[PDB]
Write the structure tokens for this entry.
Amino acid sequence: FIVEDDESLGHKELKVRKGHIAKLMATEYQDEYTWSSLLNEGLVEYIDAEEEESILIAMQPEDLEPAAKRIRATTFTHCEIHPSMILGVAASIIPFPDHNQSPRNTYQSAMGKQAMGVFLTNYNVRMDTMANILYYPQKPLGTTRAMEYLKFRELPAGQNAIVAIACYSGY
Amino acid sequence: RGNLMGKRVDFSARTVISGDPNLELDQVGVPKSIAKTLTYPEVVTPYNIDRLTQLV
Amino acid sequence: ASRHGQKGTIGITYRREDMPFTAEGIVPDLIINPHAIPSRMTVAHLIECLLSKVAALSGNEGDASPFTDITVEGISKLLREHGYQSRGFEVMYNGHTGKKLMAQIFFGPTYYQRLRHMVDDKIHARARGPMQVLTRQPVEGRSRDGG
Amino acid sequence: SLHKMSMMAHRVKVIPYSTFRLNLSVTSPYNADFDGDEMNLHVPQSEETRAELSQLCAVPLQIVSPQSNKPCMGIVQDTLCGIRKLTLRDTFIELDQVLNMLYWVPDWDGVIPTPAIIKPKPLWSGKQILSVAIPNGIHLQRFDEGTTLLSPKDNGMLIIDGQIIFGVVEKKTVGSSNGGLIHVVTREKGPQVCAKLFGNIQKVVNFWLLHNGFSTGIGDTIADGPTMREITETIAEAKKKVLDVTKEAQANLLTAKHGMTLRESFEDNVVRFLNEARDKAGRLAEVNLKDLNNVKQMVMAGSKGSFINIAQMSACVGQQSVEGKRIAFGFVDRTLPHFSKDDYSPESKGFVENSYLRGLTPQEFFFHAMGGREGLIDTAVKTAETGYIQR
Amino acid sequence: MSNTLFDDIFQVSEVDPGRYNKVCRIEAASTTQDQCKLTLDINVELFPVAAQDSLTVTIASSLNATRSWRPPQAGDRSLADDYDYVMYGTAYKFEEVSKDLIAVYYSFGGLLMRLEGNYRNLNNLQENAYLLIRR
Amino acid sequence: MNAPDRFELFLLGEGESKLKIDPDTKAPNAVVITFEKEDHTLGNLIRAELLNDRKVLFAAYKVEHPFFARFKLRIQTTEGYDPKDALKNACNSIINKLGALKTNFETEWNLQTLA
Amino acid sequence: DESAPITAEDSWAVISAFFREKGLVSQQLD
Amino acid sequence: TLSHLRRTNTPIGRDGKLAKPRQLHNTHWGLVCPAETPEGQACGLVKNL
Amino acid sequence: EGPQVKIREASKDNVDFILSNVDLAMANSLRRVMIAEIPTLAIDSVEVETNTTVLADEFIAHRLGLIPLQSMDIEQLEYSRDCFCEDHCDKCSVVLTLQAFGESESTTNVYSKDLVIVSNLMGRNIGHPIIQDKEGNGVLICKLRKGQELKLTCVAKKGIAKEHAKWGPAAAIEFEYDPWNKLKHTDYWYEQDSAKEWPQSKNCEYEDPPNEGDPFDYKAQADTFYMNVESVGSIPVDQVVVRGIDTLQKKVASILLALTQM
Amino acid sequence: MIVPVRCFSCGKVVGDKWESYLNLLQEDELDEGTALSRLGLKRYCCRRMILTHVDLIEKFLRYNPL
Amino acid sequence: TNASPFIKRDRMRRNFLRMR
RNA sequence: CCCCACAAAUCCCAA
Ligand SMILES: [Zn+2]
Ligand SMILES: [Zn+2]
């Protein structure tokens, strides 16, 4: 996001406003703003890996813009569109990756690729050497907003079960 | 190294393992398929004649 | 495996008649060792379980959203108002006798996925099979019935 | 294969449901969990081989590790936690249970010991019945820092003629240890009775756990309100001290400790302060922790857990490290493009403040990832290296 | 075949929970004896005990390699059982303090009691005995 | 697969009854009984109701392994009294009690016939 | 209003548009 | 499948060094996923957009 | 007379009642017998004459092996294994056939009511697939569109629940005793308070409060159990309860007669 | 794929209600919560399935094979 | 104190459709 | 038959 230091309304503000996002929602639900159409009029700007050494970033769109759960300058130029987007494909599946040890997240990221489920829909027609398809895939009850864009909810991996954490004496 | 100090052998198997608290130390659980496949030679004696005959 | 690297395998299988059972008559799908929790130190798994329970109760599907304001306290309050113990602990009965279990058990729904390593593909044994041509030793490979 | 163990002989009882099956006690010497391990077998052919395999490589005469002169064997996680649960003065048990669990011990004398108490009902201490599994003619004294012969804290352990007198069973007493019970029985009676002892203890404790049951959950981790508030203010005062030291440094007057460079002294002091904060917070969280907690029971009982684990889950983690030197300035004059340049505040340079319970923050998450990656790669290289050295 | 070895009345000073929900250590001083001291572990949940209470104790070697304990035998059990706290255990250590005051340590499954006083330097025992407490 | 099969759940054994007898040599009048093709659902009930009797001395049962639907049961009692008579009387008590329960249940349900 | 600021929640719409346009394999395709 | 398209790889060596790009870097922020990596003899080499 | 019973309420599918003058072992054994070995009937073997649908075959077979069937008169016939016959005579079998045609242009559904009885019913009410809903449509099997065909022949045989879940009539059970924990069989974990941190059972109002500080009644014994039984629908619920009692007593009588024979 | 039958945990028949469950969310614009509550699923074991089921035969069948 | 534990796609779809 | 990929397996800890 590009942030204009100047503001007639006062202190500082990122240029985009509510009208633009309303137009975006309207365009989407029509089933004519595109991401490109956001680019042209100067609302978001691409940043290569080199520039960051000359830019200050605001994590939240409200972190310091104006004047128990958890722990939370005035010269920002760009604000992150959303922090949860620093992940990749596989890690996006992990629910609450913040709330566990990082190597455990790495273990899961590597392992999830070894899970069955569905891989396409034409498989009844598509020959192949190897193929796994399970009976009753279920979209997990827990989920993040991301994998909706990953079409994951459409093509789930496993199915949830009623687990119990106990030592029932044998195995 | 691949043939003299270390080589393939026979009469061996490998599977996955699981625990059991109903089996004491010196014992080990083996699947009957292996017992079908893995074998062991015995020599006929006037002692094991009956058992070996039945086994055959 | 879970969604948190907590891999594992099946040891044995019981059926309902002797599996531990709750007051409402629900019986668990599978049970894991509590000791697997602290050493690996995966906490988010438990939050997933609790949130999944409350989501199933309300019917409204839950949220993960790595960096957001959702905390455990709201989950506990909502679950409690739905009429269960706030932290998810539950009275539990022993199938063999029906007696009360002395402790309580954390217990709810959780997502799993099946892995690629079925035992049948990995069992292998050999006794006096084919020999290798060059060196007269047993051949290589489970598929080729090697040693 | 690494050492003399992982090579043991075994008797075979053939089993359906194709897979291997072995006792939990021997888990550690093989260093093999059940996460999907794979395991090999070799079958002898002649008679000589069978005899010498029985007389040298059998487990019962392999209890004590010659490499460290302490038994490499020992009961493990489940039965360990359970036996700690059972061996508490505040427990009891009724006829119905004790009859069955007496019948569970294979070599039970067929004689029921008299109840320790009679007034309204015969009952028994867990120690009382557990003494049955102990072979007769064993003696042991511990006296660890309490144990006034009338031990109020009930620490230590004393056994007379294979009968428990007092104490709580612990990994420090029954696990792999220099003065462990298994060591005593193996050295004293004979290096196979210990196998029967293992079987009996495992069986009876498992049976009692079955009808007792034990678990854990989120509520285990969550702590008291005002206590975690104290944790927060302790962190705050540590931050204030760090800031004060930084202010003193920035005015060019400092200790300038002998030998090492000014920057080195600054880094040493700040690291010391942060570690002090972390462990003080962990101590406070622990002393808060209720004695009816499950995870506290588990950690003090032995097998799994640590002070560090509960500290990290409850109160704070501590700054991530990258070969000691805390996270360096990747970009010019900053560690991350969300910070102002030239800052040495702990948050700016990568101190994890929050705890796992609440959850991290993007930056702290990244630093945690850095630390984990470091550990992964270092082990993934040392494995091949040290294998070469070992060979 | 069954005789008391020592009887007395004791006055409890105070009760200690010791973060145990069902058992509590107890201690008392003798009334008739000015030197016999007593400490003991008691299952308060099974039996209420209050501070500043009179207690009666009995050794009762036996009851009028023993075989298996008989079920309570709902028929006649005409034993030394006209008390409440009837329970069993074993002694394990003897100590001579002040060159005169003997100390005996009794173990009860996991429960413990310590007795003092110096006149029965021989009447008291051997390893095992019973214990009888009324009201 | 060539293992003992799933029919051990309830399909009774071949060439042998539902039980076997063996007298213990460790205690007087002690008898152990081996049961097969059942599990807890019977053993727990039998042991509890047998323990209800006071003429018996000691009773206990266990299952050797969840794989095999077999279990053992040990009984000894006072002198003279044969254990087998005790257990048969116990079975009589069980059958009478459950029959009373049943009859009461149908009486109730027919009474509770709606309208 | 239309000139009001944006709540952190609202960002998701922008992401939705961005994916709807670009597509994941955009790198290889382009 | 999606986690196989946006994939990278660099040549460094057969065995590997232990002070060079295997460990993550500050510059990697928001460009390459800080957790989606294989482990063993290639950890820190293959990385994911 | 003995173990008195009091009924709470009942409906087409579930029954709630109180049980008194019983020992814990008997109640648990009852639970297990209802949940484990109540005899019923289910589809066991299937003949796929011709499949065309997008769905797999053995998939369809597994789905078929789960629809409940009318089983009021199940006691009338006998087990296939215990029958002197070969290949499932009418005295120990029932035959079902399915005919699905992809005729229309919209997707066509296949419901349990589509399959029909074939072999002799010999005048016993058996084999009718239950239709719970008011719409007369059983559970959905599969779907077709304009080009698919299913010709299925099914054989249903006796079976019991404990060997496989197909023959499970209960599928739902409940168990309660001492809602007030007066027996103190278990305590309650609690971070701050035992009372607030736990909810109150709906069974609380029947038994009295714990008298607020009465001395622990050690010699009290468990009784007054709370039962909830809900059947899948394959058979009326009072029927499942009485059949469970009957099979348990038959088991006990069998062991007694075996003792006598020995 | 076809909605499962005979709920895993409990065993109550599921799937007969599935098509009813759909129209409850179409012309009645209720929430899934009240939808299931009126549908009559007290236990959540019978309910998790209806929540998380993913139809795929809808995507499969709308091919044109032969 | 829900703090948005749940999100619905079809409900938001219909709400913005009637909003349009 | 070799060469290359591709995956498992060593997933800590002690008090
Ligand atoms: Zn027939
Ligand atoms: Zn269900």
Remarks:
- Residues 1-88 of chain A form one domain.
- Chain A has five helices and five strands.
- Chain A touches chain H at residues 49, 52, 80, 85-91, 97, 102, 105-106, 109-110, 113, 119, 150 (CB under 8 Å).
